[PDB]
Write a structure and sequence with these properties.
The structure is a homodimer of 329-residue chains. Chain A has 329 residues and is of the alpha+beta class. In chain A, 42% of the residues lie in helices and 11% in strands. Chain A has 2 domains: 93 residues, 2-Layer Sandwich (Phosphorylase Kinase, domain 1), CATH 3.30.200.20; 236 residues, Aminoglycoside phosphotransferase (APH), C-terminal lobe (Aminoglycoside 3'-phosphotransferase, Chain: A, domain 2). Chain A contains 11 helices and 9 strands. Chains A and B meet through helix 11 of A and helix 11 of B. The complex binds calcium ion (2 copies). One calcium ion binds next to loops of chain A.
């Protein structure tokens, strides 16, 4: 509920090519409010807040011109005078957000293409020269895994609602097993890279825009790629994984081939125990899910969706520990 | 707490080669009591009851002389006069009961052998001429899946503790999709065929005895083989599955190869939608696990182990529905 004329005035000076009249609509749902700004010349998307939005804008803006396809940025407004809250203006991209990783409704050749493009974008993101595009201080590089292991160890300990031995074993195992090979390697890391955070062209298997960058920073690629590969280790039905489905029939590549393709795109081979990267990723996911459980156990979020995600903490922790034990020691 | 002299008298007349003195010990745990009968000449195992033990004895006895390795039977006692309860006497077999399906501690070649032998025994069981060994009326053959779908549909409806849409979809989907190809095919079905129900030779990869036959009957092989293949579709950590582990590295065969081997041993190819067989198996398992939840929700079994198994009903039901949707319609 704000002054749309004050915005139209601001947009004339700060949004390239802008020309009213302007009509604001809202989207049903996204942490911070999202609106659809409509003008005859074109449509934009405004991301406001009640009253770290600026990092999304920053990373997405810096990536224009790279191979990581992203929505075009128009303007960021930190001056809460104009509308009563901070916001930014983006392009309104139109396309498909696919949810089910098994890609129902497609031919095998199509599934191959969706997966191949999805691969290409992660390789591209991780090969970007983040310093040349001005993101040099976008996050703290080096010492990624020990920083993260410690963070999530402290977080679980704060939210622990029950004794989960596999979690405890993880918290003790991980810190003593951080690969030494490529420990300093850093790149832009999306944070939550997966199929449903991609906007595909309405009919072609090509991503028009990588979405939800609010968790992104500078970090180790395998923290990002490892989380992305979870799909091959989680089974279908709540957490829409693809473990045990007949991938060769469906046209979905095997994880061995997917990693190999990523290695060739990025030019460097994945050194370091793959089971550690997986074990870490499962640990992290367990930590996040325990956060939800702790809030559900003392009623901050009672949602059916919420306690569903909370009950999944233990099995994630348990699965993490199993992969840990398959790793070098 | 019984008369061991009355048993020694009975054993002289009913147990081939018996000769005391006799010393009875008990085993820690097995539904119906189990004892270790010790004599200088040899050791036996006695399976009593408080006060369908006879089917185990019957099937295990009939299988002697076949390729399904089993403990040797000595005598069945239904005359509750002798000891105050019905019982039977078996050979005391000594060997390994392996629990973890990933087979830690082994070389790849060893894992290949454990799996290959495990395959051989199921093929063998399912190729046995049950009528020639006198089990013709051991169960009701034909119409297996519809009989089972109906049984578990009624069972879930009796124990339903919450709304599980994937379960409901299964209960409606399955009955309308029972394969018509090989619908009458029947064989002996173990019921719960898995690694931990096998007693391996202490150092060789060969099964000395298939255990826990209390659920066995006559039925469709894929009800038994499908349950056995669950391992490739369930992930590690609570339900010790092998979904997503690097099978080629570990020396564990891929499910495609495992089924192919079974087909060659049994001489007939698996006709009928594999995803239906899997979907059915997941449905059945969900039903059994909901039984436990219903008892836990109203306190018949409060055990930590019990509510762990009860919480697994939904995900099993949800995973079943996903495989159902990959099947022919
Ligand atoms: Ca999203
Ligand atoms: Ca057992």
């Amino acid at each position: 509920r704000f002054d749309t004329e004050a915005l139209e005035a601001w947009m004339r000076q700060h949004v390239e090519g802008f020309a009213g009249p302007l009509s604001v609509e809202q989207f049903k749902g996204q942490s911070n409010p999202t609106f659809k700004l409509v003008t005859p010349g074109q449509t934009y998307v405004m991301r406001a807040k009640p009253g770290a939005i600026e990092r999304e804008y920053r990373v997405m803006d810096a990536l224009a011109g790279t191979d990581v396809p992203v929505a075009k940025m128009y303007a960021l407004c930190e001056d809460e005078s104009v509308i009563g809250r901070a916001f930014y203006i983006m392009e309104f991209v139109s396309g498909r957000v696919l949810w089910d990783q098994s890609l129902p409704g497609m031919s095998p050749a199509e599934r191959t293409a969706i997966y191949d493009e999805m691969n290409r974008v992660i390789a591209a993101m991780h090969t970007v020269d983040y310093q040349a595009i001005g993101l040099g201080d976008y996050g703290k590089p080096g010492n990624y895994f020990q920083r993260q292991i410690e963070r999530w160890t402290k977080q679980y300990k704060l939210s622990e609602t029950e004794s989960i031995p596999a979690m405890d074993s993880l918290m003790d195992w991980l810190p003593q097993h951080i690969p030494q090979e490529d420990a300093d390697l850093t790149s832009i890391v999306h944070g939550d890279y997966r199929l449903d955070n991609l906007m595909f062209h309405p009919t072609e298997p090509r991503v028009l825009a990588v979405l939800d960058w609010e968790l992104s920073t500078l970090g180790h690629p395998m923290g990002d790629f490892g989380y992305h590969c979870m799909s091959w280790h989680i089974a279908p039905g709540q957490f829409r994984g693809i473990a045990g489905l007949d991938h060769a029939a469906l046209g979905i590549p095997d994880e061995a081939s997917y990693r190999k393709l990523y290695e060739q795109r990025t030019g460097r081979p994945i050194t370091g125990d793959w089971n550690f990267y997986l074990a870490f990723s499962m640990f992290r996911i367990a930590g996040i899910l325990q956060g939800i459980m702790k809030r559900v156990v003392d009623g901050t979020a009672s949602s059916a969706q919420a306690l569903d995600a909370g009950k999944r903490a233990r099995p994630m922790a348990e699965m993490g520990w199993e992969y840990a034990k398959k790793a070098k020691q």
